[PDB]
Fold this sequence. Notes:
homodimer, alpha/beta, Rossmann fold, CATH 3.30.1330.20, 2 domains, 11 helices, 10 strands, GTP binding (chain B), cell cycle (chain B), Cell division protein FtsZ (chain B), GTP-binding (chain B)
Amino acid sequence: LAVIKVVGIGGGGVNAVNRMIEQGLKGVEFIAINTDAQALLMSDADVKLDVGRDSADPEVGRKAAEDAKDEIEELLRGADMVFVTAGEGGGTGTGGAPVVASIARKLGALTVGVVTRPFSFEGKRRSNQAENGIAALRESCDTLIVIPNDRLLQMGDAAVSLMDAFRSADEVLLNGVQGITDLITTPGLINVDFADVKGIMSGAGTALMGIGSARGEGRSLKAAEIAINSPLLEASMEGAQGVLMSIAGGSDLGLFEINEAASLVQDAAHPDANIIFGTVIDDSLGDEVRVTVIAAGF
Amino acid sequence: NYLAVIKVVGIGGGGVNAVNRMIEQGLKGVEFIAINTDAQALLMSDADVKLDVGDPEVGRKAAEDAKDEIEELLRGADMVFVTAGEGGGTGTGGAPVVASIARKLGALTVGVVTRPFSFEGKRQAENGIAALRESCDTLIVIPNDRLLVSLMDAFRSADEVLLNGVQGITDLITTPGLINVDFADVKGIMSGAGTALMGIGSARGEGRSLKAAEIAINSPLLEASMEGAQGVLMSIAGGSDLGLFEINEAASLVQDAAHPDANIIFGTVIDDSLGDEVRVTVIAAGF
Lengths: 298, 287
């Protein structure tokens, strides 16, 4: 029984965590860390830590987290797995996320970062800051999944508003966390457990994700094809040496269709790729199946 | 007055986190108080009462500055637990202040303190124990080394015994069982008793009460202090189907194992969520 903690740090990470809670993500403890007590008050996270109270600058965010490092470690003690989520580009997330991940990693927890890069329209300073924060977080994570927000706009609705675009960013962060955690907490016919996940995500390094869903005839092939070709994968599926694939569906998700999706992914992967295939029971999906691919080792 | 008023104070990040864990696990019949002692950070809490009075010396001074408010929080209590939980920091300086206020008020004052695993290294901790000991009636010391398995099993195992450091005793007082205790006897055995050690034991099915009790009494956490103890508190938590004979067999075992001059308070707790498991807690004080 793996103990999994999902940390959202900074407004962006805390927003993402609230979304995970609202969408019913289970089997995990939610931890919100921010430099804003009022925002935290509104959060439904299980644990809430307000940091840097005496002090969008990443250094201020780094020091607030460093100053609270004993406290953060005490909250993470006992976790088998720690997710560190943030919207890179601001101060608290950018600066603080590497501190949290270092602590988790020192404790020996399987440490997964899942972060967004800001949209280009947010400006060059947020983009430059996100890039430094990402390199920093990369050093302290087993796997760092980076989601380019720019690529989210090549999906979804063309008349998308600004709020809709940021909600989409939150959603994809949820998708990245849940695609992994549900294998462990609510497995289907093919049970991929914590030890399996740990084997493929330990020291895997920088990673990209792809997501697809579909309903009806050939739903599994279609969802897997969509996920394989996801703009978020940056057409780097062919080069990945490690791939973790998650397929979620109702209790009637059959092995034949699981296998059809798995076969499609093998044919699209690098010849030497290590690919783990797992399934999730999610009775709330109806006739739809949801495929998630995590690609690493390029 | 007749339903004993018990207050559980978590001070510092570790203490507040412990209180949050106790709330989350459904520990009943007590009032929870979370006291934040850091200026730069605040761990939020679902405790009944929260006080933010934000290095041990820093924690001590911060608590001293808020002593009138803390005294008002504790006023009325028959019994006060004080802990800074796992990890050091400002809480270790604040906890003795809270304990001496609780006690100057007349409450039975019980500190719970942990000694970290040796594998954690050392930065003070001992100074916090001594100061907390001087400020409490009883100080329950939990040496985490005796818990020894992954690193995360060890930490989770430490959190569990910390929680029981409070619940084993409070449940005995607050939650009815077949055998109920007189709080005056609890006060009698714990007032000015000094350092106490704890043993826990668990078993299910056949012979469960004797097995659980035997495990509790031979617990490495008691450091073989059971033979010499002059004060022993023992609780058996189980379902409502817990028979008097098996209960008495367990009570009998602890008497035989204890020093003949020992003072012994014994009771049971009806917790029906345990199924066919029984959980024994043994608190031993004196030499």
